[PDB]
Amino acid sequence: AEKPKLHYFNARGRMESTRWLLAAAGVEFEEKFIKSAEDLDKLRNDGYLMFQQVPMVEIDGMKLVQTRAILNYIASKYNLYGKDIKERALIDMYIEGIADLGEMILLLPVCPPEEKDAKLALIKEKIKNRYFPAFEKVLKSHGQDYLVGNKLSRADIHLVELLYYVEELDSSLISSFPLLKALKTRISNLPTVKKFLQPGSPRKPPMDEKSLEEARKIFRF
C-alpha cells in the first residue's frame, strides 16, 4: 500500500545502512530530508520521534526509531535475517562487529584534530588485525558465497557496505583478504545492489565538511 518513508538529513549518517538494506531487498522507499533544526523540531513537536531523534522510518503503520529496530524489522520482513534462532545468532554476532567498526569510521570526522590521526591509525590496525581476519575466517570456514546459511542475508549487505567505506579510507586494507574481495564483487553484482551502486540511486556520498556542518546545525552539536 504505502512505501516506507525515511526521515533523516541528506547524508549517509545513521540512515545509510537502512538505505542499503531496503535497496538490496528490492523495496522502493521515499525520503523526507530534514534541512534544519526547525525541521527536526517539527518532527519532535508532531509526536513522531519516540526519543526525539532520527533516523525514523514510517513502515507498516509504525513510526520506528532506533537504527537497529528499523533494520531488524526490515531484515525479518524480507527474509534477510536467517532461517532460525541460531542463524540469527550468527548474523547478529557478525553484524555487531560490523557495527562496532562502522561506528568508529562514522564518528572519526567528529574527533578533535589532535586526536584524529591516532584514531584513524587505530581503526586501520583493527581492520587489518581484528575485523577483516574474523570475516575472512568465516568465509573460509565454509567456502560458500554468503556469510550465513548459504544464502543472502543482511550480514552480507552490511559487510559489503562497510567494505566500500574501508576502501575509501585505504584501498590497501582489503588486499590480503581474497575472500572478502570476492564477496564484495558478488554482492555488488546482485541486480538490486548493482542498481543501488549506479548513479542516481538513493545511495549517499561521503560526508564532506559542509554536510558535517549541516549536521551540527540540525542536531545541535
Added chain:
Amino acid sequence: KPKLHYFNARGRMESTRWLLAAAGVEFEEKFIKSAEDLDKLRNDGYLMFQQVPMVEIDGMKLVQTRAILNYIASKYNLYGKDIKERALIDMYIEGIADLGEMILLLPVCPPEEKDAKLALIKEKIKNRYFPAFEKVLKSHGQDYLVGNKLSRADIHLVELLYYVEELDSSLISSFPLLKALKTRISNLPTVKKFLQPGSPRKPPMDEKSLEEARKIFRF
C-alpha cells in the same frame, strides 16, 4: 548451563545476567581476572573479535552483547509474539541501551569532563527517556510494556531504573507508572530472587574494579 565469560563486574555482561535470571535460567560464570586470562580465551579461539562478553550456550560461543541477548530473549519467549512486537521491543530497548551506555562509561570519562557528563545524563533521563517510557505505559494501561505480557523490554528497563536510582533517587519521582513497573517486576519470583543478597547480581563498579578492567582490557 550457559557459561558467562567476563570479569567479576557489571559492565557489558550484567544485562545478560538479569535476562537469564528473569527467565529462570541457571547459569555459570567463568571470571577473567587478568590480561593473561583474556589472552588465553583469545588464543584458544573462543572470541570472534577477541572481546568479551562471550556466552557458551547451546553449542555456540556467542560474542557481542546484542547477539547474546537476542538469542536468549527469543529462546525463552521474551521477545514478543511477532515481528511487529519485536519492533516495539527493539525500539524501546535501544533507547534503554543508549542511556545505559552513557552511565556505563561515566567512570571512564576524563575527570575534567565527568561533572558535565553526569549532569547531561540526569537531564536526558528527566526530559527524554523517562517521559518516553511513561508515555508508552500510559498509552495502554497494561502491566507490561509490550503485548500485555512479560518481555525483555520490561526487564532491561527495570534494570536501568535501579541504576538511575543509584545515581539520583529523585529522578523517577515524577514518573508514577515507571515506579509501579519497577515494583511489579521486582516482585516476580525470578527477579525477586535475583535482587536478593548473594545472587549473581553485581555491584556498582568501584575504583578498584575499574583498575582491574583497565589491566584486563588494556585501556
